Structure formats: C-alpha cells, structure tokens
Point group: D3
Chain length 297, copies 6
C-alpha cells in the first residue's frame, strides 16, 4: 500500500529495491537516478526509472540511498514536497544536529523523517540503548569487522583519481579499529595525493589507516560485514552482568531492509524528525499490532 521510491541506485539502493519488492505493505513506484541511460540494467526491466521524484506517481515515502554527505540536501528536498524520508546517514558526530535540522522542515511540510536508520547507526543504536538501561553502570564496546564499510568506501571513491576503492574495517578489540583501504587508481592519478586525501578525511582521521594501491578492487571486495557489541555492567547494585550481540551479514542488504522498516514507521509518526530509538519497535513491523504482541513478546 505505502507508495515508495528508491533514490540513488548504488549498493544500498539495489538491495533497497529488493527489500521494497518483498515488503507486504509497500509498493515500488520507481527509482530516481541522476541519469537514465538507454541501456536498461536487467533488474530494472519493468521498473520506472526517472531523474526527478515528481515524475513518479503519488510517492508517499522515499528511501534516500545516496552518499551520506549528500543526505541532508536530499532529505530536505523530499521533505519540502511532503514525502516521508529515510536515510542511513552514518556520521555519529553530527547526526544529532541533522535531526534538529530536519525536524522543523519535516513538521512544516506534514511529513516524517527517520535518519541514521541502518544497522549502525540504526538497529545497533537500539541495542546500545537496551544494554544501557539493562545495566546503567559499566562500559559498552562495539567492535566492527572484518568487513566492508560502505560509508568509508564511498568517501574514498569520491576522491579525484580514484577509479574504485574498498575500505575495510578490522576490529582491534575494546572498541578500537584499524582501517585498510585498497585503491584502484585512474591512469595519471598520484598515489601520494590520494593517500593524503584519504587520511585527512574526517572518516579516517581518528583511526590507524593504511592505504594500498591494487590492480583490481572487485577481486578483493566482499560487501559482507559484522559486529560484536559487548557490555559488562551493573543491574541495580549487581555487578558483572554480561551481554553480547553479534551479526555476520551482507552490509548493504541489511541496511536497505532496515531502511524499509524505518520508512514503514516514518509513515506512522507525527510530522517531524526521528532517530530509531525514538520510535516504538512495533512501528517497524508490518500490519496490526496485536499479532506481533502474541508472536514476539
């Protein structure tokens, strides 16, 4: 029923299309791309592809599957048209500001926006909140990898001279990580300059980063990723409460599925902007509540 459009046909966008088609409560009106070539990708045969969302039926919701750094602008554009929006904006240091920014825009145009709705930020944030209130005193650790960071990869591919890139995240334990970036340079690019731009990027300035040039990125790339979140803390006055959550998943696949759920929820909220911990988890499930209560609680 909910009419949706996938914006940005990249990694997450391609899985988003599949997530929307499998969804029992949604309808894929079309796909919004920067350009639409005469050669139609196999999986888009029979799918409406356009350069502007307005040329797409009566779109009520949009999955913003574009680069994180482009999320703010797209989000505002869709919101100003009264279209609910979901994105997986992953900059932890700024998403709280983005929410305050989109809130009024969303409210004034009678729509809802759910930002940072991937697995991290996203579902892992809900997990961190659970662990936070289950054992208030202590420390939580979120260890990523080994795997591909779609966000870091996009930032490297954005560097001039980079034909293609793979940003891998390696867990060093205790919340600390190391990053290995493999770059496929364009003919004429200067490795040293590309290395400088990578390490200077805010995405990379806080972690030990190692850049290596390679002949082929696709030969080394696997979009799989994972996480291990752990907490050793106190329940009331009771110490040594141990919690552990782990995933070994297809990064883009899970992100897109989560984004779909967040949009299902966005369409149920009062106009405004939300992060995933501000929405009752039942709003992420399709259909009436009763059945989910009996099945899950």
């Amino acid at each position: 029923k909910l009419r949706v459009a996938v914006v940005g046909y990249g990694n997450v966008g391609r899985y988003a299309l599949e997530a929307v088609q499998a969804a029992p409560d949604m309808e894929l009106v079309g796909v919004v791309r920067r350009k639409v070539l005469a050669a139609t990708p196999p999986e888009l045969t029979g799918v409406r592809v356009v350069t502007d969302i307005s040329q797409l039926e009566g779109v009520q919701g949009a999955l913003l599957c574009v680069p994180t750094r482009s999320v703010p602008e797209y989000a505002e554009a869709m919101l100003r048209r009264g279209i609910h929006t979901v994105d997986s904006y992953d900059i932890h240091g700024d998403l709280a500001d983005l929410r305050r920014r989109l809130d009024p825009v969303a409210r004034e145009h009678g729509a809802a926006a759910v930002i940072s709705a991937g697995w991290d930020p996203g579902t892992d944030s809900i997990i961190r909140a659970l662990l936070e209130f289950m054992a208030p005193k202590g420390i939580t650790y979120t260890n990523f990898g080994p795997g591909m960071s779609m966000g870091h990869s996009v930032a490297v591919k954005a560097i001039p001279g980079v034909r293609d890139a793979l940003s891998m995240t390696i867990p060093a334990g205790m919340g600390v990580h190391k990053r290995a970036v493999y770059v496929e340079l364009e003919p004429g690019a200067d490795f040293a300059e590309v290395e400088r731009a990578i390490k200077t990027d805010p995405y990379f300035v806080r972690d030990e980063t190692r850049v290596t040039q390679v002949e082929s990125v696709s030969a080394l790339m696997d979009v799989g990723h994972g996480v291990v979140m752990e907490r050793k803390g106190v329940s009331g006055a009771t110490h040594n409460q141990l919690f552990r959550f782990e995933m070994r998943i297809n990064n883009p696949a899970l992100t897109a599925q989560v984004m779909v759920a967040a949009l299902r929820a966005a369409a149920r909220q009062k106009p405004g902007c939300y992060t995933m911990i501000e929405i009752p988890v039942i709003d992420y499930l399709p259909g009436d509540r009763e059945a989910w209560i009996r099945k899950l609680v």
Copy 2:
C-alpha cells in the same frame, strides 16, 4: 524525582529495592509486604515498610514484584488508585490478553501500565522484534539456560508440601528446553503427589520435566540464568543473514533493573497499558533525550 514503591519483597523485590535506590531519577518511598514483623531485615533498616500502599507518601509508581499469577489483581488495584504499574508477568500465551484487560482500567484512572517487563518477556521481546524486521523471512530461536527460572520456581514453591524448590531450565537447542526441578519437601509429604502436580502445571505441561527430591535446595540454587537468541534469515531477497544475542546474568537482578526502566517509561506514556515493544526505547533512559541520542545512535 519519581516517587516509587516496591511491592513484594522476594527475589526480584530485593533487587528492585537496590535498582530503585541506584536510579538517578527515582525516590523509593517504601516497600509493601503482606506482613511486617518486628524483626527488621538489615537491608530494610531505614526503609518504610507497610502492608498497604496507601500508607506510603504520594506514590506515583509501583513495581509489582509478586508472583506472576498474582500480577493481574495487584495491577488492577494499583491502577484503580492512579498508580503507574510495571510487572514482569511471564506467561507468553496470556500477556496479550492481560494488556487488553488492563488498558481500559489504566486509562480510566489516568495511569499507565507496562506489563511483562523483565528480560523475557521484556527486553528479549524488543530483540526478537528487531531480528524480525531486520530479516523478515526465516526463523528465530530463543534458547534459555542453563539457569534458574524464577517463574517456574515460584510455581513449584506454591505447591502444597513443597518447603522450597529450584526449577532449572536446560537448553536442548533449536528452541527446545528440558526442565529439572529440585524439590525440598515438607516433613511427611507425598513425593509422587508433589511430582505429579509439578509435571501437570501449565508452566511444565509442554516441556520434558524431571523432578528430584533433595535435602537442601539452597545448597544447589544459583539465581543466574542466560539466553542465546539466534536468527538465520532473509534481508529483502538476500539470504543467510546471521544474528546472535547472548546474556549470562543474575536473573532477578536484571529483571528488577528492567522493571525500573519500564516504570520510568510508564510515567511518560499516555494513560493505558503497554508491552515493551510499544514504547520508544529512549523513554527507558533517564533524563533528556538529546544527550542519549549523541551517546547511543
């Protein structure tokens, strides 16, 4: 700030008291017990203890730490007084109905009730809900133990002729569980009788149960418990997404802590009755939302 009362001073009740005292946004007005002897238990020295909640300040919320089967009547009594209530009612097949029964009573008295707010039902429910929407197709398994089930223990304890009892839950894998009950009989009691009663209790009727008489239950009892929840499912059209969540904790201590977070949440809801998946996870955290968003998302 929030004035609270712990109702029922047993296992969970003891930890509930500690959980409330450690919470930054709550004040423990007192403890409600069926009886108050002249001999004051040490941890209660300096704590108001009465047989009726009416003799306690201006109690705004109450943690119902009484037997599961006694929860319905207690919740209705506190609600009819305008007191928010939280309980850890653990009968999965019935809780949905309990929610529908308490909803109107809660609403008509301007109060909010959060039922089944322990770790399972409770937080494990929120977890199951996440796994469900992160990968809509497939199967989720919840394996408990090895550990003590406070609920099953209470049930056995109530049986006539049982001086004390320990109900252990053993994980057989794939969601199947074996139950081992260690019962300490009262002088001159019919074992075969107690045994028969145990096996046919709705709490035991569905699982493979073994009963063994022992000289001392306290010599064998440890209130530790744990869980392993797993899901192998499909995100969109992408198969083999793997998720795993595990806990190894003091059972009653976690439950009491979760109940505390839930009551905090209850005081923030519109009058009515809710299960934990019907509340935004951030309302379980004390204080303003903004800081929690920067820290967790």
Copy 3:
C-alpha cells in the same frame, strides 16, 4: 572462453547463471528450461532461453541444475552430444555407481563429466579425503545445519499434494541429524498421506523426520546452510590430531560456484567421468597454473 549453458533455472540454476557471468574464462550462451513463457523474468532479459540445448550456439559445457533424480538422464543426453557436463548429484549411496555408468558414455563421445560437484558431495569430499590421509586412523564427523537442504526440499516438492516445501537439517552432533519439514499443502491434499510419503522417501527414511503443515513456506525459508566437519585422529603413530572445518554459506550460491569450477576442470580432462577427488585441485582454477602455485602453495 568455454561456451557454457545452464540447464534448469531453479535455485541452483539462478546462481549458476550469476556464477558463469562472473567467470573470467567462460561465456554464457543461454539457459535451457522445460518451457519458455512470454513473460521474461527480469534477470533473463538479454539472455537466450530455449527448451533444447541444440538451439544454443556452440555449447561446450553444461551445468545440470536439475533435480538430482533427473541427473542421470540429462547427463547422458548431454554427453551423447559431445558436451562436457557437471551436476551436483547428491545421493551418496550410489554416486559411485552413476560415475561407472557415465564413464563409458562420456569416453565414447569424447567428453568429460564431473558428477556430484556441489559442496557435499563435492568440496567437502576433497576435505574428507585430506583429513583421511593427514590422520589415517580415527573417525570423521560431518555435521550439517542448521539450514536448508536443497535436495531434500526438491524431493518433498515432488510429492503429489505439496504446493511448496522447506526441509531443514538440524545437527544432533556426532554425524547424526534431525530433519524438520515444513509443507504448504495443495487445496484438498491430505496431510497424513503427504506426511507418510515424506517420511518414507529414501531421502528421509534414514533420519528422524518431523513434518509440519504451515500457511507460508516462503516466510520461513532461507537458503543458507552450513557444516562442521571434524576429525580426531592419528598421524603416523601420534594420537589426538585435531582438525575442524566449518562453513556458513548461501547453499545454492556456493553449489553453483563449485559447479562452474568443476566444469572448468571437466573441459581439461581426458574423456570420461570423474568425482571431485579424482581431479587435481589446480584444474579448478582459471588460467595458467604457474600463477596459482606462487599465490597458493
């Protein structure tokens, strides 16, 4: 490049197509299906689809992605046309016999056939052989699941009255397995008779099998599967040598990828029929040998 055709567009066939397309030394000529409807599934847009392999260019090799019980007939058909063939025939009981049956047919038509080339039988077989000669004395245990057995699922779907079916394999440990079948019955079929047919099928008669009728098989089905192969044996006269191999993979995806490698190898062999342990592992890698030796040995 090796001109290749995919026979049977089911689960394995779907991934097989993707496997061939990604292969650097192969060209996908077309797909052979029992029938070709006017409605072209998206992924087959631009792909030649016929009902007889002879209407496909100059096919040199064929991937028999048909039901295991149909493999012998397809293989002979293909072999009699000078086309190398590969299948994932999974009946351990008599695959050795199939090999003896196809050997002369393959030799007399100047073609090679590599049978039972999935992950088990297939790659797991090579692993069992290594374990076997690395520690000649002791016992090997191959534990499957939890996951979907594509072969058992196909067998159940073939029973009259079954609309759709899922056969999951559960590891009981020590090489023992339990099978849980979920069936979506056809309007009118009798559960009891379908259940009897499933339990007595040669695929299930040797394992504790449980059958359950469900409303939706697709809601529970995930094609992921896995294995844990272990061996505690003797090297020479030195006891307690410990080996362990494990996989958590997309079942049909891996099967098809292996079939492509097996076909690559098939084209390099003398005319005849082989199992995977009768072929040097290097023949499964594309291109000249030298590079793989330096990279892998």
Copy 4:
C-alpha cells in the same frame, strides 16, 4: 609395497619412520643419516641405518626430512638415481622455482618429485585453492600458532653460537604474525650478534621478531602447532560466504604423515615435479580408488 627410505633422522624424520611403519602400502627399507654412531637409539633397533641411500635395498621412494635449505641438493641427488622424492620445502617465496628446477631432472630420470608437501605448504595449500574457487572474490587469511615452526627453529639452530633454539609463531590476526625466539647460547657466543643474525635471516626479516636467551630450550619446547585459515568471499555474485579451517596438531607428526601420502602419490605420477595442488586428492589414499569414492564422496 613401495620400498621407502627416510633421509634425515631429525624431528620430522623420527615421525616419518613411524608414518611409514603404519602405512599399509609401504615398507621401510632403512634410514639415511649423515653418520651412524655405535650407540643405536632404541627406536632404530632392527632398522637398517646407513650414510648413503645406495646401501639400502631397492629403494623406490625417499622422504627428504632434511633442512629446507638442503632440500634442492638432496632431491636432485635422489632423482638422479631414479628415486621418487618428497620433501616439505617450506619457502613460499620460491618453491615454484624449485619445482621448475626439479621437473626436468625428475623427468629425465623417470622419477616423480612432490615438493613442499607438509601441512603448509602442503595440505593448507589445497585448502587455499578450494577456498579460492568456492568464492573467487575476497581475501583469505592464514593465521598460524601459537606454536613451534620447525623451519624457523632449524634456521636459528644453524647460526654459529646457538646450542639449541625454539622459534614460536604467534598469530597477530589478519594474516599477521609475531615471532618469539628462545635461544640456548653456546659457551662464549655473543647474544647481540646471534640476535642480529636471527632477526636478519630471510626467515625472520619479514616478521616482528623478538629473541630471548634462556637456560633451557627443552623446558619450553612443545612441537605442537596450529592454524586458522579464514575466508569471507563471493560465490558467483553472492557476498559474505564464510569459510573457516582450523588445526591443533603435533607439527612434525602431521608433516611426516603428509609426506608419506605425497610419496604414495609421487609413485603414481608421470615423471616430473609437482606441488600438492597438481595431484588428484585420491592419489594420496592407499589402494584402489573405488572404495575411497564410496566412503568419502
């Protein structure tokens, strides 16, 4: 049976003898040592021990259990006498070159040579090849230890001044390793110079190496070793395929057992030089093929 001689009665040689004695298809003709003292070690009682392979019956195959840096010369010597040879040459850097060097010598004398046939290089190489074709895209990580590297230990023992030495390999993760060397110095030798020689030896120059002088190497030495080989890759176009192989074994025991199997295979090959991935796995099993197919595939 295949008449076999063990060349080099060191660690590997000792287990090699036991491996041959347990082999159903082999006969131990004798052992070749640099010298034969009048004091016969217990285990060699009844075993013919000479200084030149020609004084051994009619030896058809030889296990070169000599230092890796001595292998090329021994292999050629043996091959020039029409004797099939097997070694565990472990220098990954140029074993491919050794193979090209021995190929003609082996072919021109009608004998077969299987080089680098230990567990790594050796069996682990076959495993890396399988992983390679099961999931063509992604990266493989081979993590060693904690344990004793027989090869690095031999190199250290060869340095002037070293009375005895132990070189342990420590897994740092992601294919990275740290090496901890324990040396028992000869009366008078200088630690600083021995330390320098160790650290700059080609065996150690590529890894973070630490050297420590000890009073007794035998007190710390255990020949056990292990490995964890992992791969997260793509099958066809399906990402996140997870594979893991692990062993906890007696290093030299396994090495010698594999060498025996490699020699068994060597005798079945056309004259020439091979690595283990160039030989069908079934040639490593004793006796007719049929039985192994039924038992393993």
Copy 5:
C-alpha cells in the same frame, strides 16, 4: 564454630562479611574498622563493629581485607595476638619473601597465616601448579580481563588528588596486558601530576598504561573480572597437550570467598605461614574429609 573477624570494610571486606555469614563452619564475631560513625550502614545493623580486634570475643581468625601494601603490618599484629590470618596480598614478586617473614612470627605465637589467598594469587596459583606437573615442558599463559583490578584501583585511589579511580586490565594475549585507568580528580588537582604518579607506580611501571580523567568513576565501574589460563605442553614425551581454564566472576566476591576457605584451612595447619599451593586442597572444604572424597574424587 570458628570465631571470625573481617578486618577492613571496603570492597572485599563487604563480600567477606557475606562469605563468613554463609559459611557453615564459622561465626562472624565482628568487623574491625579504622573508624565507626554513629550512622550504621544497613548491612552492618546487628553486627559488632569496633576499631580494635581486642574488643571482639575470642576471635580465632581474621580476614585481612585491607590494602595489599598494608597487609604485612596487619598480619604481624594479628599473628602476635595468636590470631590466624588470611589475606590476598597480590604482589607476585614479593609474596615469597612475605611468607618467609611471617613464618616465624606465626610459629612463635602458635598461629597459622595463609597469604595471597585470593583468586590470583590464590586459586589460579594452584591451577598453574597443576598445569605445570600435568605437562612439565612448555609455557603457561595467564590472560586477565577485560575487568577491574581491585589491587591497581586501590593504588590509584591512594594517590593524592584522586577522589576515586577505576583500573581496568585488558588482555592483549600471550600473557601481555594493557591497563586503562579512569580517574576522578579532586577539585583543583593537577592531572598531569596524578597521571605521572600512576604510570610510575610499581603496579603500573611494567605494562602499557593509559590514564583518562572522567566526571564519574561510579558510572563506569563494574567489579567484574575474569581470566583465561592456557598451556600447550608436554606430558612425558607426548607433545601438544592442551589445557584451558576460564572464569568470569565478581572479583571481590570470589576473593572474599576464597579467603574464607583459606582461613578455614589456616586453623587446620601447624603454626606457620603458607601460600595456597602448600595446603592440601581438602583442608579448604568444611567438615569431615570422607564425604568430600566420595563427592569429588
């Protein structure tokens, strides 16, 4: 039966009190504190609390739950009074000397002293001793954490300017540890100064230490800790024997419990001073030996 006194009411002291009360063969005569305020802590309601052990019954044994560096003087004082003593003195390099110093003082006053009786030193020592004689050759590694070190915390706490502190121990593997100190400073204190003092404390001088100032230590502190002890060694002439021991426990609670068992043991020894490996493990069990032999051996 055995009349006991808990000396020092801090972390371990609190649990020591609980440990003594639960022990079947002991009576808690009282608690010795440097000061006794009019405000009686709830758990001490009904417990005799004094500033000198002479004001407590006929104390026969004392648990010295005071800072490690204060243990020597306290032990000598209790011993000179004929009181058996147990402590958890954790300085590994010094304890042997402490044993030689307390031995005569203990003997000349007809008392027994068991030093360093926590879990490490203490029970972990007994464990290391077993692994040592079960496999005499090889190496044992003791990896602590993640968790809080009561000892290191006390040390930091004592530093001038530190209001409160949390010393966490992180396992780097192979016996190496990283230390993370979280310090809550007193108003107007020099961080760089406190930081400098910490890093040079004998407790910290040998390991990689990081110091971080925080607003609240209690918000981060959890007294849980753990350990993983492993040994790969030789039993006789048989290599690769693998042993592994792990604990995940409430640090101060286990220590207090072990100290209780040790004191029980102390009252059973000939006058003098002992470490835990110098006492038959059965003297740590209450009551007659016969039953323990039937139950444990």
Copy 6:
C-alpha cells in the same frame, strides 16, 4: 634419584616409562611384566624387564599401570614390600573404600600410596574441589569426550570372545554421557553374548550404551580424550559466578605423567593412603619449594 618401576606395560604403562625417563628427580630401574618374550620391543632395548619387582634393584616406588580391577591386589603386594605406590584406579563409587583399605597396609609397612591419581579421578578431582570451595552453592558438571575411555576399553577387552575393543565416550551435556563401543570379535565368538556382557558391566550399566561390531578397532582408535568441567554458583552471597575448565589431551599420556607426579608426592608423605586432594599441590612438583612459590603463586 627416586628409584621407580613401571608395572604393567600397556597403554598407560608405555607412556609411564617415558614420563619417568623425562622426570628430573626419578630413575627407571625397570619394567615389571606378566611375561617377558625373547623378542624385545624396540623402546625397551636397554631397559630391564622382569616378571617380579623383587628382581628390580632397590625400587622405592612403583607406578601400577595395570587394569583398574587389578589395582587393589597389586597395590597391596607392593605396599607389603615397603614400596610406595601410585595407580589411576577410576571407579568413583569405590575408590573411597579402597583408600580406607590401603591406608593401614601402607602405614604398617612404612610406605605411602596415592590412589586414583590420573586426570579423572585425579587432577580433575582437585579442580572440582577448587570450584567447590570457590562457589559453595551451585552445581558442577563434568562433560567427557568425545574420546577414548581407557578404563571402559580395558573392561570390554576383558570379555571372552573380544579380540580388541574401543570404548568411546560422547558428551550429551549437563554431566550426562553416551557410550559407543566398537568390538573386534574373535573367530567363533557370539556378538549377542558379548553385547550382553558389555551392557551388564558396572562400567556400562548407568549410561546409554551402543555396541557395534567392526573389522578393525585400530583403524578407528585414537587415544585422545578431553573434558569440559563447568560450574555456575555462589561466592558468599554473590550469584552467577562462572567457571570453566577444558582439556584436549592424549589420555594415556596425561595419566602416566600425573601418576609420576603423584609418586613424587607419595614419597614425601607419612606412611598411609591418599587421594590427590589430600596432598598439597606443591608436593607434586620436583625440587625445593621456594622456586615453585616465586614461579607459580
């Protein structure tokens, strides 16, 4: 220095010989066998083998490596000659009686005896005692396997008609085990009768046992074994204390090494009989105590 004899040259006995030769504080005077053939086993060349201990020098201690059921009689024989004795008598239900039986015999002849000194009973008993006093309330689980039980194997080999046997122990979790016995029958034996005798044996009457006839036991036999002992209990009043100990070892190898340590200890005790929990663990280590204190505590 301590002069020792190995009695019974079977599995444990052969490793016992090696354990004694590696021991720094012992001397192997000889081996006592029921018979001594003209053909000397390789490893006994240079070792004195006789049919009666009296023909062995000045034997001060003896390792009784004979069947458990023969231990009582041998133990008494050696003790009556003033020879310390060690055995690995594994019948848990009776060893407590055996101790009371040997005690007076040992004392009257001025010797010491350490019974049930293997790994279980033996070192695992010491482990169980530690866990018992570290957390008094709770339950301990000892899970064996998969592996070979030397004791059960001996009992089956003792059955008339059994040419050779392998008794494997499989862990079913929670202290429960299953037993798989593989028997190689003599020509003429009756499988049914052998099966009856196996299942009737006290060694097998308390566990689910399955007997299978096979052509070769040596083809399936691996003397490796292991254990996982776990405890979830209370330290004082603190619940959920988690402990876990695991071993993957050469069964006979470890048993013999432990027996050697027990004898080293036996020679340090006052005349009498002991189980391993009645001896300070330091007495199991060679040489002066001081060094072990500084190294282990």
